[model samples]
Target: GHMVSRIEQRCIDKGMKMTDQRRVIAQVLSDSAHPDVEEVYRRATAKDPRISIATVYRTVRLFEEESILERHDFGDGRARYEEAPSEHHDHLIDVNSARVIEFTSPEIEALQREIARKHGFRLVGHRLELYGVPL
Candidate 1:
């Protein structure tokens, strides 16, 4: 079912079974932006109607186990998932709409290094996300 999607290659290389539902799920998730299970299920249903919420639950869990997806907990009850990005960036969340914006700031990066160095440690990696509400 998947000799087409970018994610299909990853799943293939990982030796995933690539069942019908999973194939559709992977394709749907390819363009996701911090979407949760409900959203993913919603999208998955659009391309095909065979998959169920049960299928999506298992499919998402399997994808996460393979490191193909990253989870974001925006403190909004449900967890959101996105495909792991190759480049480093930070996220800004709009509390009003739960929209995620990607941005990078050297000032904030430098400040984090300074703070970590002041604590007698060298930084290795970090996860930075900002939550904002429109004024």
Candidate 2:
């Protein structure tokens, strides 16, 4: 796709060499549905069959550490990833399906800040995800 090339170009612009494996990993992460480590490996292995499973595992962690991607545990057995530098939003997980959706609300953020202030502590980190089912 056109956008894939743009992402690759950005990688180069950032002075990051776009290796074949890293390109494959980035393409998969950018294109696939929000996938856990295993799912990403499954898809990426299709791109470059020679890329070992260990490489997939390592690359995902490396990307997250570089802040090029974000990972969420999603309260499941595996952690999932999405392209970083996207909009800031919280998540909602479907308990039955294990599906995740990103949502954001300035009002909720304000309330959280107020609550933290009331407790005499600054909010450093918080993960507010609601797990529920279809009504």
Candidate 3:
């Protein structure tokens, strides 16, 4: 959480508004389940009653374009959002509940490069996700 705050401070230094809606959205994204648009709207509205669904959508797009937020597509057909401008990590999705969990592994990166080399192409973009039900 402290790490996220430091990154937020850097974004603030870069002239990001950090408006009430933005801040609330940031706070929610910082700890949300890689929420989809509807979920994001729900959580954000819970924070500030004045925030409408359109406001949520606009804020999300702004944050994402400003590199303050990221998008994740779960293959379930809906895209999700999270805080950005931080270190990279893969994700795990809860199949039943659609929860999102972030995970990192140095070996994952190393292996990805190895795979790319084997395929005779330089890796430019990639996403790693593991989705399943809980025991």
TM-score of each: 0.57, 0.55, 0.53
Compare candidates 1 and 2 on lDDT and give the better one.
1
CA-lDDT, candidates in order? 0.79, 0.75, 0.73
lDDT of 3 by residue, 15-93 (tens): 7867677677766666675788788778877878788888888877877887777787879888787667543677888
Predicted model with the maximum TM-score: 1
Candidate 3 at 43: error in angstroms? 1.2
User: Which residue pairs collide, candidate 1?
Assistant: none
Model 1, 42-95: lDDT tens digits are: 999997876799889888888888877777798998878877654478888998
Q: Model 2, range 1-135, lDDT digits (tens) per residue?
A: 334443354355345767888788878877785698778788988988888878888887877777667788778757888767733578888999999988888899989999999999797544476888999
Which candidate achieves the best lDDT against the true structure?
Answer: 1
Off by over 4 Å in 2: 1-10, 86-135
- Model 1 per-residue lDDT at 70: 74
lDDT of residue 64 for candidate 3: 80
Off by over 4 Å in 3: 1-7, 85-135
